[PDB]
């Protein structure tokens, strides 16, 4: 009969459904593919870290050609470069320029700090854009470092300065009027964003008062 053979066909199916669920199940057990977003982070971490050809205050054009042009020429407003590597986002980027990025690490004073090396925090307070501007900001920030754990106090000096594209280096000094203010030099070049090799200097001679390897925050 009609009713019949059907009663089992629906079974052969109710079957497959299970042999499959017992699969989709054994699937979830095995993890989810890491978020291309992972590889990307590797290629990054890696890429940040080898020499570049250029002697100082020249930087290479972003793109395929190596070619080295002097740091200064940015910007014409126009593509200094033939390549126009510039025009590409990785150069004109928002995040890069973006203000109110903060970097911290554990400052261990060669010089000052009798006490046990304390937390240093150099954070950006404002930095000039205009519209177009592919380039490096000329900026203001704050350098804060704990007095103590005990004291629960903390020094906060205001700074002025810029960021060198070519150098990958952040150079800040006390704004003024303090006459002793302290300043700070942070080198990018892991190649990473986040990470920098900062050193608290004396705004005079640019002599290293203390050193701290920083991360963002």
């Amino acid at each position: 009969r009609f009713q019949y053979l059907v009663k089992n066909q629906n079974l052969h199916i109710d079957y497959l459904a299970k042999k499959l669920h017992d699969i989709e199940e054994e699937y979830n057990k095995l993890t989810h593919d890491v978020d291309k977003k992972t590889i990307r982070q590797l290629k990054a971490r890696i890429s940040n870290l080898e020499e570049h050809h250029c002697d100082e205050h020249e930087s290479e054009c972003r793109g395929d050609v190596p070619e080295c042009i002097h740091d200064l020429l940015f910007c014409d407003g126009e593509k200094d470069c033939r390549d126009g590597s510039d025009e590409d986002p990785e150069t004109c980027s928002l995040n890069i320029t973006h203000v109110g990025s903060s970097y911290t690490g554990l400052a261990t004073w060669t010089s000052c700090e009798d006490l046990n090396p304390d937390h240093a925090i150099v954070t950006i307070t404002a930095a000039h854009r205009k519209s177009f501007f592919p380039n490096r900001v000329w900026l203001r920030a704050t350098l804060s470092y704990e007095l103590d754990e005990h004291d629960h106090t903390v020094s906060t000096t205001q700074l002025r300065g810029f960021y060198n594209f070519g150098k990958r280096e952040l150079l800040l000094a006390p704004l003024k009027g303090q006459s002793e203010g302290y300043g700070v030099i942070c080198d990018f070049n892991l190649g990473d964003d986040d990470h920098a090799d900062c050193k608290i200097v004396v705004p005079s001679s640019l002599f290293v008062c203390a050193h701290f390897n920083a991360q963002r925050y």
Binding site: Y27, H32, P117
Partner: protein, 220 residues
């Protein structure tokens, strides 16, 4: 009636072969874990990325950046505030845990007469305290497969030693053997856990007689 229903089967029979072939794919898929491969590269690269710190000092985590003396830092209680150690990922016993067998090729400078060959370090036993992270005392069996005049022979000696959590080092010295075949030494950071870089050395000399790169053999 009979056609649309008897044919709706040639449709189902298909899913049967499909679902089956699909099983084979789920088997192929388990062999390439991406999340695994990526980890290989991470470790592979981290391996490339020296110490700032001084030797037999412990580098803290991201937050600060400080050096701590090894013995002090692996108190077993928290060395530091944070603490780097306390976080479960490092302390995790399992990966570390011995009982593993490690094999690999031992290329000699040729302090030993004998041609290159394979060594097979296999952890016999391992005491600590109940907890006990820092230090792991252990006994192990070191074999080699070398040819004498005549057929394939196997030189096994028994060894005693320790594993230094921080050191990422496994030191195996001979017991009291007449052979007293020279002491093996392996370090962790391959960046795999599995894998280790070893060397045969003499105690007194504390020279390196041979290079040996081992890999944990699968238990199954």
């Amino acid at each position: 009636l009979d056609p649309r229903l008897g044919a709706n089967a040639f449709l189902i029979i298909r899913l049967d072969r499909i679902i089956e072939k699909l099983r084979t794919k789920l088997d192929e898929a388990e062999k390439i874990d991406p999340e695994h491969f990526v980890s290989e590269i991470d470790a592979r690269v981290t391996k490339i990325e020296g110490t700032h710190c001084e030797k037999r000092t412990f580098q803290c985590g991201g937050n600060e950046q400080e050096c701590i003396s090894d013995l002090l830092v692996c108190d077993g209680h928290k060395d530091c505030h944070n603490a780097h150690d306390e976080d479960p990922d490092v302390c995790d016993t399992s990966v570390v845990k011995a009982g593993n067998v490690f094999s690999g090729t031992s290329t000699w400078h040729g302090c030993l007469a004998r041609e290159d060959h394979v060594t097979r370090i296999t952890i016999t036993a391992s005491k600590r305290r109940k907890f006990f992270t820092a230090r792991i005392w252990l006994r192990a069996l070191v074999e080699s497969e070398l040819e004498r005049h005549g057929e394939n022979v196997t030189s096994s000696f028994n060894a005693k030693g320790y594993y230094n959590f921080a050191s990422r080092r496994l030191i195996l010295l001979p017991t009291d053997d007449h052979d007293d075949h020279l002491a093996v030494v392996c370090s962790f950071n391959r960046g795999d856990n599995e894998r280790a870089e070893c060397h045969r050395v003499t105690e007194a000399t504390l020279h390196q007689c041979a290079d040996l790169f081992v890999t944990l053999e699968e238990h199954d």
